[PDB]
Amino acid sequence: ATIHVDGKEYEVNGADNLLEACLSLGLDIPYFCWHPALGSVGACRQCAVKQYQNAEDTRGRLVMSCMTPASDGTFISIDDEEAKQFRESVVEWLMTNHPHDCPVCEEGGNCHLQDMTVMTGHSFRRYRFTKRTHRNQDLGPFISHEMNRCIACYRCVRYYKDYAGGTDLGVYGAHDNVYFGRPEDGTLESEFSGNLVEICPTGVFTDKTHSERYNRKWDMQFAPSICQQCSIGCNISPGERYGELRRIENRYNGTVNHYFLCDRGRFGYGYVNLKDRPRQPVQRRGDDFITLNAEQAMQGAADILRQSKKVIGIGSPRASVESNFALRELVGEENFYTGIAHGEQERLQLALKVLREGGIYTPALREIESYDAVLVLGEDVTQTGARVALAVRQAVKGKAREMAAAQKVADWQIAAILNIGQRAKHPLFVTNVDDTRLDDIAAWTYRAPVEDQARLGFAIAHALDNSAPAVDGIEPELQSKIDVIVQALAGAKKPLIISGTNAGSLEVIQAAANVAKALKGRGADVGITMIARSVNSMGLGIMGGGSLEEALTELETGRADAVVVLENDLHRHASATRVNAALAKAPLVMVVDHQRTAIMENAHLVLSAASFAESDGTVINNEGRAQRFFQVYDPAYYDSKTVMLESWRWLHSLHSTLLSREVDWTQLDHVIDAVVAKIPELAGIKDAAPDATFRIRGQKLAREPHRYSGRTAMRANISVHEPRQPQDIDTMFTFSMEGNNQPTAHRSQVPFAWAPGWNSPQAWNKFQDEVGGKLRFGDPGVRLFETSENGLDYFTSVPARFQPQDGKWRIAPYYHLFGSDELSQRAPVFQSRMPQPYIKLNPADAAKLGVNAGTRVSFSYDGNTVTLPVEIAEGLTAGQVGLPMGMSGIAPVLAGAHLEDLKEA
Amino acid sequence: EPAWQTRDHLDDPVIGELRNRFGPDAFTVQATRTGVPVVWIKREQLLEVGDFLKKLPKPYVMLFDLHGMDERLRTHREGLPAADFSVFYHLISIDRNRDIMLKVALAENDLHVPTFTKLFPNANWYERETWDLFGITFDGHPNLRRIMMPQTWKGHPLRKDYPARATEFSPFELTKAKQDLEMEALTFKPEEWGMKRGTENEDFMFLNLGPNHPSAHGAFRIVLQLDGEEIVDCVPDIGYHHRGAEKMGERQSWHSYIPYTDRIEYLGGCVNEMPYVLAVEKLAGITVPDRVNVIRVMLSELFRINSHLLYISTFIQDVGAMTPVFFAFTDRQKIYDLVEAITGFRMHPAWFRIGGVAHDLPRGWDRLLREFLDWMPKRLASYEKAALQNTILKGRSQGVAAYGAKEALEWGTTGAGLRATGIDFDVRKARPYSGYENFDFEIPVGGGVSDCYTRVMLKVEELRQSLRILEQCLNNMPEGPFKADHPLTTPPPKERTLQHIETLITHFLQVSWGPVMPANESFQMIEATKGINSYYLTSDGSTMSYRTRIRTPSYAHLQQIPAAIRGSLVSDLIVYLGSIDFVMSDVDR
Amino acid sequence: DYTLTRIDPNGENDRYPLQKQEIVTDPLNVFMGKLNDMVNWGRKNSIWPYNFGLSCCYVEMVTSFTAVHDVARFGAEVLRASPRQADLMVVAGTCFTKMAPVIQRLYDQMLEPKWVISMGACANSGGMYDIYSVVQGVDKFIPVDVYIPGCPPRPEAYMQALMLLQESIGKERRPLSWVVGDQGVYRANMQSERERKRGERIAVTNLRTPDEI
Ligand SMILES: CCCCCCCCCCC1=C(C)C(=O)C(OC)=C(OC)C1=O
Ligand SMILES: CCCCCCCCCCC1=C(C)C(=O)C(OC)=C(OC)C1=O
Ligand code: SF4
Ligand code: SF4
Ligand code: SF4
Ligand code: SF4
Ligand code: FES
Ligand SMILES: [Ca+2]
């Protein structure tokens, strides 16, 4: 479409309103209530522009650009006198009751309201009367509430209810006494409530975790990184100050995680700032714990490694691609073992084979919001891959979107779309061991053991395509529900099947693959999505290796007298007693880790590795996208005795000292090129980010804003002589503001969003080709594999029906967004959010055992008689015990296992 | 219609003459807030355009400025030719009282411009500076070497990819090898300058006058080739006082750059502050009220009297009489008492703001102004009758280092020298800024010869006229605001900031991120204490300056130095150095 | 509570300053101590500054030289233009990169005894000019006795630093003769002025309002 802004002709998209069309062209219109993801509601009345219908028109009409379509032949004026005075008056009306709170506000310097007050040019106060006040609510450990700063723009409630699907946030009150919050005090139990601190243009909802150790946005040193708390791989902007990770901001990736994170990835970063982390190489001599620098650690480690007959390496899915590859190239191809168990590795390799060999296109996370009918098999998505559950909610509301689009209603008229699509929504069928958080929008929820979920998946695949193997023994009511699912999936245009390795069963993934194959055989645009466990599970599966049990028996039989463990606690994937015995029997345990794990008591040498905030690397997410994360800060700038290096740097220098007796600190691009040379399946990680020689017109990319303060005083307590800024030889970024962060720079890795006049997270508008669309000059990260020309065959191994055996109890996994991650649970702020360890029981099984809700029963697994209190679960099937995976003492490897001697004690 | 509006400047007759000479498809006209016609011309026609401007009926006889600009990072270049670098030539015609700014666009690989030294002899140091800081080569230049940086310097500092801060590079480690290498670099090599270090009868004497000399007014060195006592040739070596203030202008916000403007000419103070804040107000679109103009005129005339007192005492000291410097610095202490009362600081006040001044006048400033105005004229008459009417001082001064109007125009000489050549060109009258039209004062001119004595007596008359201006402004000071009511006035008034939320928001975003001045080019030229000081500010639409070009008169005077003292004795050079009114922060910036 | 410095330009030490400093005790004799006190008094009550200036701080220093301040009362006005005749180098101005060899040469050309006063934020640390062409403090390569914060420090602050230098000289130990005795330079580890004045600085309650004069 063609519009005329201030006499200048512009070519815009006619399906967009005037606000996003003009913001895409670089025209600054003030706005509060409009968001690119939420839609247009016309509340704040800030986006006023003067519209003319003809080229020869003098009077015009003040309209809302967010509510006015960008049709062909509209002549709008933004900087007309009447429009500017009205926008200034709207800012003034918002300023009548706003508190004098900017110095004591966490949103100061990051405030959209401040930016829009300055942009309209209102700086004189003529209001002389009183300002209304509000009491504040306790919203939990994550979100701090300050209701006086609200401008009643309704972004919070629109996001929290119409987007995130939350139920405990709302609008209350009246004429000018509007309150935004909960009906009482309590924690916001939505898994995406952390996005309120960036959705809210004011300082009402603030990051309490950042408010504990608060610094302003200009004082933050930012980097582009990837969230390491699960497999989705959302792009984040970690920002630090004074040597500690202060905040995790959302980093816009129009392909993956555009505007929203989950609460685990936004508030689970506190393990980086733990004081028990290793900061030097520490060597154990008997009972003494001596501290070495890097060179003596390398020389001693290489001496003992040369004095051994075989060295094995146990990687981890928590480590990056480069560190696992450096371990593999240090110990050899045959001596490298993945740190996961045999069953976890089998499920992971099956999921990878389905993804890159099944012939079915695995969608990106933004593309999940366009699929019609969603079938989740086995996965508890909202607790393991929560952002995928958010995109599933969007795909479910796609039915109301298409129904309103059938009535010539614009895409951005979100209120009219929700009015037309009252409760009609796209079909969602979730299967789990219990009730999920998607059950409010699910067309059906199947509460059954994983064998029965797999059998239901195989029955769906057989009913969709008769060539699929049949399962006999299905009840007629279950058959009716199955044919309902089949009629919903067959009538869909873009069906989506979501499974994963967290269900603890191979047949669930096989059934999901068979359903996807049957949907593809009918000529449908089927997509499949596997949810892995850790951040780099897919990279570890692609690189491959032996299981943890093979490494454990290699250490136990004595063939391996030297074990190098890379960022693994080894109690998460195997029993603690067997691991402890194997590591105590081995005469050399050398652990490269950045968190104080339990196997460091037996470790003969500990290498203080760097976490994601202090290391560069590559991670492969659940859809096979190689994403590069960059270092945020140098740990040794403030604390001079800190010897903390990248794990791939540790292992590369260790291998160099092993071979040539010389210590060699490599570069990130050298290790990347080594991965591309040795592993052809990981060849796409070279193009994930450009190398360290990349420049924007000769200068590097700045990690901190141009108004970074305290340079000559932040280190003056140590020494009055300011040292050189740390040099980044690994990446194209610099640990200084002497660099480039323009919105029009030809790059894909943006550390943070700032524009002149745009200090809020609304500054991401300047960094996109169109607002709410893709990032300018493409999104970061590339896909490792394409969709294959041919697919797999039908998995004929249909499992038998789950029969509850007497005495033995099948362990049903219960994943928690706060608690089931290895590193997020070490954050001190997650202690007040993690649920108490409760074993879930059927009413019938608890009545048989004589247990009621609340009391404690004891169960023994591998000689560990541990006692948990009982919570009654109605939806759990009989014969199973519900256990929380990832908690203290309950490994995720316990899923699907047996449980003997379950007695009340 | 306000004077800060973006004017296309197609009504200037010079534009019409250029159209009728070179055709209508030979150049582009850039609409700026400089108040000067900006003409983007091709590199091939640069010398022809310069010759045409030099051969006009009322010609552009002076090269005011010549410098480069890195346009690789400039996002808003609508209506401009495509360029990775550019070179601008600011020229003045005194007869028309007009300026022009010619801009030449250069690609990143083809960074060569024809030399401008044949048309204007003062282009030599400007082209050396542009090569040193931007890497732009000038074809046909006689001796293109580094003038601000030492010869063993890698990279060009004013390029956008060069790091601005010392903390980016390694800390300064002075070793024996580095000391020897930099001492060999600092050693004068007469074969490079074609000095011809010998004669059949006798040998020439190569003497370093400076950095450590009482006659040198800073850290710079003149290398003198001598026979006996006579000067054969001089090489004034500058760059020893380089603080990187333009690169610092690219590094600070618009508000936070004001103290750095204060230290450009450290005897000037508010006189250094005025052109920068006026150019920023042109960028913002701020028209300050009458009280702001009168207060700024007050402080700049006070600091002009301070600088002239120091200059006269310094000249008398270098002639040989060591007494009047004590009394002149006592008068400087009286002015410092008033300035400490008003601004709170002695010598670098940093008191001017965008849209006004930092505070209002304190209660009782007129008492100290009356005290100084009563104390001054008797002391000045005593200085005159004791030292300035001394026949030994006249013998050391009159006829020493004399030049006419042609040498003053071809070397860009401004201030008291240009008026001492008889050319009545003062910025406060020709292009009146800050409401100088409301003050009755005279402009002293010379008889046609710019002696040391003539320049000193002209500065005495300028001091007397500044006393007259101070008396007029003391007797008539308006009762209004000390800050403008514009939203971009940085910072806003303090009490409204302390008790209103709109003012608090504006203050919060103006002192932290900086005021957002929209993308435009601005220029302000003022009459400094030592000549003409100009600020040329290119804004990219951000909160920091994209380009800050500072033109200073002491640069032109020090470049004029070899052409006016060649063939004289060293004593004439000492009197010439004492009678130029230069500081070296002014030169090297 | 003393620090001992021995210098050796010809020894194996590449980085400036070419000296070695340790922490020792006071070596101080019924008449040698009194004669050392007398020569310390004579040195502290007659300090001849070097006529070396870099920037605006030197302008305030020569403002201190004039009649309205009269630093001649302390006997510190003679202002020799030669490094050999000077006893005190006041680095009053920015330590530029191109002039750091010049400053090092002029410091080498002074003679024993020598003292260094850095005047202003540029001489102390580089000040406001964290720029490519400025040495971040003259104490990177010369030993500095007294530091003066300010930009510029007012002339009375320069005389205050001169009095601090006199107090430092009046209790230091130096070789009396170059043929007999130890040649190392003993300087006192005095209490800093910040902790000395913290008692009277914290107790400040009210000041005059800025609207007055
Ligand atoms: C000791 C008796 C009073 C001396 C007063 C000197 C006043 C200033 C003299 C001029 C001057 C200035 C400004 C100056 O900046 C300078 O360079 C460092 C000089 O050389 C040492 C000067 O001579
Ligand atoms: C052993 C005897 C030592 C005598 C030292 C005399 C030092 C000079 C004092 C007089 C003086 C002279 C000659 C002098 O040259 C001078 O410089 C202008 C002075 O003012 C700063 C003086 O006060
Ligand atoms: S929400 Fe924004 S405008 Fe309101 S007090 Fe906080 S920083 Fe100031
Ligand atoms: S709390 Fe924030 S997001 Fe919600 S209406 Fe108020 S200003 Fe808008
Ligand atoms: S969904 Fe996973 S990758 Fe994304 S923010 Fe949450 S924990 Fe991090
Ligand atoms: S500290 Fe200030 S007054 Fe002293 S030399 Fe530096 S800029 Fe000049
Ligand atoms: S943005 Fe249009 S009314 Fe709020
Ligand atoms: Ca690194």
Short mmCIF file of C-alpha atoms and ligand atoms in Angstrom, two decimals, chain A residues 32-33 113 145-147 149-157 169 171 178-181 196 199-205, ligand 4:
data_model
loop_
_atom_site.label_atom_id
_atom_site.label_comp_id
_atom_site.label_asym_id
_atom_site.label_seq_id
_atom_site.Cartn_x
_atom_site.Cartn_y
_atom_site.Cartn_z
CA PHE A 32 2.02 2.99 25.18
CA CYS A 33 -0.75 0.39 24.89
CA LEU A 113 7.23 6.34 29.92
CA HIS A 145 5.00 -4.49 42.45
CA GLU A 146 4.74 -0.68 42.60
CA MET A 147 1.23 0.34 41.60
CA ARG A 149 3.69 4.27 38.63
CA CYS A 150 0.93 2.75 36.49
CA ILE A 151 -0.47 4.64 33.50
CA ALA A 152 -3.41 2.22 32.93
CA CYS A 153 -2.22 1.05 29.52
CA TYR A 154 -3.55 -2.53 30.00
CA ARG A 155 -0.48 -4.20 28.46
CA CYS A 156 0.07 -6.43 31.51
CA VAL A 157 -3.42 -7.92 31.63
CA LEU A 169 -3.78 -11.14 36.98
CA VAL A 171 -7.96 -5.20 36.15
CA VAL A 178 -7.84 1.11 38.16
CA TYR A 179 -5.72 -1.53 39.89
CA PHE A 180 -3.66 -4.13 38.02
CA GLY A 181 -2.72 -7.29 39.85
CA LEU A 196 5.75 -8.47 32.67
CA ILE A 199 5.81 -5.65 28.77
CA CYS A 200 5.02 -2.96 31.35
CA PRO A 201 6.22 0.44 30.05
CA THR A 202 6.50 1.73 33.63
CA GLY A 203 8.14 0.52 36.82
CA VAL A 204 5.10 -1.27 38.21
CA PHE A 205 6.35 -4.80 37.54
S1 SF4 D 4 0.82 -2.02 35.32
FE1 SF4 D 4 2.18 -1.44 33.55
S2 SF4 D 4 1.47 -2.74 31.80
FE2 SF4 D 4 -0.19 -2.74 33.38
S3 SF4 D 4 -1.62 -1.06 32.71
FE3 SF4 D 4 -0.15 -0.21 34.26
S4 SF4 D 4 1.56 0.72 33.03
FE4 SF4 D 4 0.40 -0.72 31.65
#
